[PDB]
UniProtKB/Swiss-Prot annotation:
This is Protein KHNYN. The gene is KHNYN. Belongs to the N4BP1 family. It comes from the Eukaryota. Transmembrane segments: none annotated.
Length: 52
C-alpha cells in the first residue's frame, strides 16, 4: 500500500501529474498548511526547485 506519500506529490512537480503538491490550491499549499506530509512537498520540491 502507501496511499498518502511525499513522493507522489513531488512526482507532480518532478515529472508526473498534480497529486498532493499539484492539486488546485493544494499545489504550493501543501507545506503552507498544517500536515507534515504536505509540509515536505513544497518544502522539499518548491524550495529546492525555486532556489536551484
Amino acid at each position: 500500500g502507501g496511499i498518502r506519500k511525499t513522493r507522489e506529490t513531488e512526482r507532480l512537480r518532478r515529472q508526473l501529474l498534480e497529486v498532493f503538491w499539484g492539486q488546485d490550491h493544494k499545489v504550493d499549499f501543501i507545506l503552507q498548511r498544517e500536515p507534515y506530509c504536505r509540509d515536505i512537498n513544497q518544502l522539499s520540491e518548491a524550495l529546492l526547485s525555486l532556489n536551484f
